[PDB]
Amino acid sequence: GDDEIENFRNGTPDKLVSDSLLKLKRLRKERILNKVLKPTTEERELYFKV
Amino acid sequence: NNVTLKNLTAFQLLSQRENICELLNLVESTERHNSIINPERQRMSLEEMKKMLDALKNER
Amino acid sequence: SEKKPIKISADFNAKAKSLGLESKFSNATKTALGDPDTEIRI
């Protein structure tokens, strides 16, 4: 995606990685609070991006 | 309405701490001290005493 | 800050709280593992 190209050209990709990991953790917490096992598509996409 | 060891110890410790904090003047208890004295109630009671005394005076 | 930092009143639940002893009048504390929802989730 374009976010990666920007956060590479403008330096600091680590900020993108940290924000994406926070989003992954939040999504997993929401996935635990209601009983569901299969991760959604956006979680797979964030994992692949990281 | 029930009294257990925890309640008793908490009550005693609260009383002690309140007294000590009052010694160091670290507490302002104007609300409590004026709800207990209640100067309005003082005036009411004084006027009631005066009326009762007048009643006893005039019955003779 | 400048004046007396306590200001005791005639409530005994704010009075007790302002002097530290707040949970010390309840039987047992409040925890998270006591609800059936969290139990079902675990």
Domain ranges of chain B: 1-60
Cβ contact B28–C9 (<8 Å): no
DSSP code of residue C19: T
CA distance B31 to chain C (A): 6
d(CA B50, CA C40): 72
Which amino acid belongs to residue B31? E
Resolution (A): 20.0
Residue of A nearest to C39 (CA): A33
- Backbone φ and ψ for C34, nearest 5 degrees, come out as -90, 0
Structural method: cryo-EM
HEC per residue, chain B: CCCCHHHHHHHHHHHHHHHHHHHCCCCCCHHHHHHHHCHHHHHHHHHHHHHHHHHHHHCC
What single-letter DSSP state applies at residue A13? -
Asked if B27 and C6 touch (Cβ cutoff 8 Å), the reply is yes
Q: CA-CA distance, B33 to B23, in Å (whole number)?
A: 16
